């Protein structure tokens, strides 16, 4: 029998994203050269833009090498086949600094990386036992087909790892105003502890879409891959992957993909300035909040400096704090109708 | 002394717009082939896209002809020189049906056209006595400079002929999210009776901009030309002109440059689909209204069909004709702007 190696969920999700073209142009778990150039130069050796290393890691060096075909185990059964193209070890700390901007294990993304081990295997993979998908978890080809069918030419994608608050909804509405349709694409893979569980994200968005948005033009599908919380660099990753799903536009608000306040609020806007056109337009929007003077939800690009004093910040951190405290998040933060859904997963 | 011809206010304004490049590629008052190609095939004979015929009309055929230099007179002096390159007569009715989509004198646009005379002259123009322009009445070149002065590379232009209402501000808001800056370019030329006077809109806007908008990123200048109310075609006109003022984007809402219910609310939207890339991006936005369920001013593209029966349409007509001593609801007009709307 073939040499076998157990693999976690992050791995099973990402080998599938590789095989489905979600991570195109990356086609297989990266070689050391690929990992390093991606991490330090934001390019693949061949020249294409890419910022997030896709790796198959292990805590103990595997008993396999170039040319071997290995069975990948998950959930007890053999799920896929790996065509090892290289076996190497990485200096995770150096890698984390380049990808996350810090090597502190206090960073959730950094911790997840370290936990997987320094031994890596590169190579293409073939899916044997596809993981069961729900109607929401559509493949890039299924999404692009969905767009063609409905005749959507201009499509703005919206990334998210949380339940929606009024600020998130503003981005979605901005998208609705500029495109034939908007793709709300929640991350379905592993997240840090204080993010809302996928089940409440799914119920919250379906309610927001069903009762407050044109159901007609809001495609709600899920992207199954972990959050890296790498801010600016993850933003580029998010945009590129959405491009593979058929999006022509990608929203990037305040502190896109950040953890706490480690990255500068708009570094994810700026990073695109230091990169070549990507084949998908970036729609940047500043901080979104509530303004009594303006008369409701607004942003820094539409609200006068003189209004500051009266602005009310909108963030899920505040929202969860309010809920964990027994208090009810105000109407200017979250919609009252979604509250029961949120209290349920806090 | 050279031949003298009198000209109306409208004429004085466009002759300058022609010289300031505000109507590029339109050089000077077009010929007969030019007037027909534009009005029927939305193109200059050359090939450039253009929809509104720029004409110098007279109720009585001028005694001048090709090759002649004519002196134009506005008040009581020689405002500019005209190099007549052709003289002719036009079938105003057949010209109107093409331009405004009708020839019914009930149309504020066809009317003004008729009262100008079926006789017209063509040819380049040279200004000799530039009419006094306030700080707002900036020329195309003066506006392009104002943009580089602030480094605005992406500019969204907004066309308006009335006072600011919530739906108007909405479109300006949208522009502020898409570009480094937004150009609010009110029409300073002649408008029909019901449209708010330049004076009031000018004072209402800078009050809005000052107390409710990024004072720093909202350019408020006026375009000195008359309103044609040509609906869709005037929309293309507005687009191309604002392009010359340096805007990269142009906003077009519901029933843009329309009158009563003459044109289909979205005709000014579809017309761009039948034209080639203009060199300026058209930002289409549907009906804008108030919605309690959405929680404020939303649009046909952001408010679901199921909220319809709760929407509160926004129109400057109702407002204007409602101070009947009434008071426009907050969800349609900013209260802080009534003292200006009333006066
Ligand atoms: N208050 C806010 N103002 C503006 N943009 C925001 C705000 N909160 C979140 N966003 C943006 O909206 C999307 C929502 O992201 P979240 O789900 O909160 O977290 S993230 O990891 O996907 O960025 C991202 O583009 C993010 O930058
Ligand atoms: N209620 C509304 N909903 C959507 N767009 C609107 C609304 N009112 C005005 N607009 C649009 O905003 C601009 C304001 O136009 P108006 O001054 O009312 O008339 S126009 O003659 O200049 O077009 C135009 O782009 C117009 O189509
Ligand atoms: Cl329903
Ligand atoms: Cl965030
Ligand atoms: Cl956080
Ligand atoms: Cl960088
Ligand atoms: Cl709203
Ligand atoms: Na380490
Ligand atoms: Na940290
Ligand atoms: Na007539
Ligand atoms: Na519908
Ligand atoms: Zn404000
Ligand atoms: Zn609504």
């Amino acid at each position: 029998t073939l040499p076998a190696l157990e693999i976690g969920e992050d791995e099973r999700l990402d080998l599938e994203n590789l095989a489905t073209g979600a991570f195109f142009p990356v086609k297989g778990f990266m070689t050391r050269e690929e990992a390093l150039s991606v991490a330090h130069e934001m390019r693949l050796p061949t020249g294409e833009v890419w910022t997030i290393p896709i790796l198959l890691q292990f805590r103990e060096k595997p008993r396999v090498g170039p040319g071997n075909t290995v069975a990948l185990l998950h959930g007890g059964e053999r799920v896929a086949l790996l065509h090892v193209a290289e076996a190497y070890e990485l200096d995770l700390e150096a890698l984390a600094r380049a990808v996350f901007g810090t090597d502190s294990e206090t960073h959730p993304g950094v911790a997840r990386l370290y936990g997987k081990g320094p031994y890596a295997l590169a190579g293409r993979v073939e899916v044997l036992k596809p993981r069961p998908r729900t109607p929401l978890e559509k493949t890039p080809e299924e999404v692009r087909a969905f767009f063609r069918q409905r005749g959507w030419r201009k499509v703005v994608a919206f990334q998210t790892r949380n339940a929606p608050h009024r600020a998130h909804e503003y981005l979605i509405r901005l998208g609705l105003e500029l495109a034939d349709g908007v793709l709300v694409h929640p991350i379905l893979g592993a997240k840090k502890p204080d993010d809302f569980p996928t089940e409440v994200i799914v119920e919250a968005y379906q309610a927001l879409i069903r009762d407050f948005l044109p159901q007609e033009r809001v495609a709600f599908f899920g992207l199954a891959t972990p959050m890296r919380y790498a801010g600016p660099k993850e933003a580029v990753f998010h945009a590129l992957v959405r491009k593979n799903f058929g999006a022509t536009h990608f929203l990037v608000g305040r502190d896109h993909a950040g953890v706490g306040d480690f990255y500068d609020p708009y570094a994810a806007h700026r990073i695109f300035d230091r990169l070549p056109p990507l084949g998908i337009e970036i729609v940047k929007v500043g901080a979104v909040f509530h303004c009594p003077l303006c008369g409701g939800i607004a942003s820094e690009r539409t609200c006068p400096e003189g209004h500051r004093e009266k602005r009310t910040a909108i963030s899920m951190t505040k929202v969860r704090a309010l809920l964990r405290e027994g208090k009810a998040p105000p109407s200017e933060l979250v919609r009252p109708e979604l509250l029961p859904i949120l209290r349920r997963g806090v």
Side-chain angles (χ1 to χ4, degrees), chain A:
Chain A
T1 61
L2 293 176
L5 295 163
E6 293 291 340
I7 62 161
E9 294 276 0
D10 287 5
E11 295 66 36
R12 192 180 183 186
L13 292 179
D14 283 357
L15 70 83
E16 291 209 3
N17 287 317
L18 280 164
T20 62
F23 287 172
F24 175 83
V26 186
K27 305 169 191 295
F29 292 107
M30 303 179 175
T31 61
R32 180 237 249 156
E33 170 184 33
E34 273 160 346
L36 297 183
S37 66
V38 167
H40 299 284
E41 310 190 72
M42 305 194 294
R43 306 270 188 298
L44 276 179
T46 51
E48 304 90 331
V49 179
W50 193 263
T51 52
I52 298 294
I54 308 310
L55 316 164
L56 199 64
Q57 305 170 67
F58 304 89
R59 304 197 190 80
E60 297 134 290
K61 182 191 173 189
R63 313 297 299 181
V64 302
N68 297 193
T69 291
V70 182
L72 297 186
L73 300 169
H74 181 70
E77 50 171 49
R78 169 222 55 183
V79 169
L81 258 34
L82 173 65
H83 291 307
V84 181
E86 191 198 21
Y88 64 103
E89 209 198 74
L90 286 164
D91 174 0
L92 297 178
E93 282 174 37
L95 211 230
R97 287 187 226 106
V99 179
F100 302 95
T102 175
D103 55 21
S104 171
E105 184 159 31
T106 60
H107 183 307
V110 167
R112 169 130 284 201
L113 171 75
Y114 292 175
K116 296 182 182 309
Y119 307 101
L121 256 22
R124 292 207 186 319
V125 181
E126 286 172 304
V127 176
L128 283 175
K129 294 289 195 178
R131 54 174 281 278
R133 292 188 284 108
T134 66
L136 268 29
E137 297 154 85
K138 293 185 178 303
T139 68
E141 194 182 308
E142 293 181 305
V143 173
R144 296 185 308 241
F146 177 84
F147 291 161
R148 287 190 286 276
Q149 176 222 307
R150 283 179 171 54
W152 292 6
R153 291 189 169 192
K154 189 176 182 190
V155 179
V156 55
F158 173 73
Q159 139 79 34
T160 186
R161 82 204 197 210
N162 238 327
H165 53 221
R166 291 307 288 289
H168 294 139
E169 180 174 352
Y170 177 91
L171 285 254
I172 291 175
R173 277 165 186 272
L174 200 197
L176 281 163
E177 277 286 8
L178 310 162
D180 302 318
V182 170
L183 163 62
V184 176
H185 217 188
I187 281 293
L188 301 179
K191 296 196 247 56
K192 61 198 183 79
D194 57 356
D195 272 346
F196 270 110
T198 71
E199 195 189 300
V200 15
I201 287 181
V202 172
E203 286 168 23
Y205 268 105
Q206 290 178 314
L208 176 69
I209 286 168
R210 179 214 316 138
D211 312 323
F212 305 85
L213 261 18
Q215 307 167 188
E216 29 257 355
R217 294 186 307 121
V218 177
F220 181 64
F221 301 132
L223 175 53
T225 182
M227 266 305 300
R228 275 73 173 182
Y229 303 98
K233 288 187 171 191
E234 192 162 13
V236 178
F237 171 70
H238 283 163
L240 253 17
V241 176
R242 270 43 187 248
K243 171 193 180 185
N244 292 327
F245 278 77
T248 54
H249 295 62
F250 183 67
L251 291 155
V252 176
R254 181 186 185 284
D255 195 25
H256 184 106
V259 221
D261 307 81
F262 182 76
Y263 305 101
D264 294 336
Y266 303 117
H269 282 188
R270 288 180 254 115
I271 188 174
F272 285 98
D273 288 343
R274 307 194 301 281
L275 292 168
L278 304 170
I280 184 171
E281 226 67 3
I282 305 303
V283 188
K284 306 170 196 181
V285 351
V288 172
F289 43 67
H290 171 286
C291 182
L293 298 180
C294 282
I297 287 60
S299 73
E300 279 180 0
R301 300 299 276 187
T302 66
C303 184
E305 183 60 51
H307 293 182
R308 179 172 299 288
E309 306 172 1
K310 283 67 176 182
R311 298 172 179 179
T312 292
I314 300 181
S315 83
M316 215 44 123
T317 293
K318 174 189 294 182
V319 170
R320 292 176 62 79
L322 243 28
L323 290 163
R324 258 192 295 279
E325 181 170 49
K327 293 185 204 158
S331 318
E332 42 269 72
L333 269 44
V334 174
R335 286 184 176 289
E337 301 82 354
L338 305 176
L339 253 31
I341 292 175
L342 301 182
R343 300 200 207 81
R344 214 167 288 145
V346 73

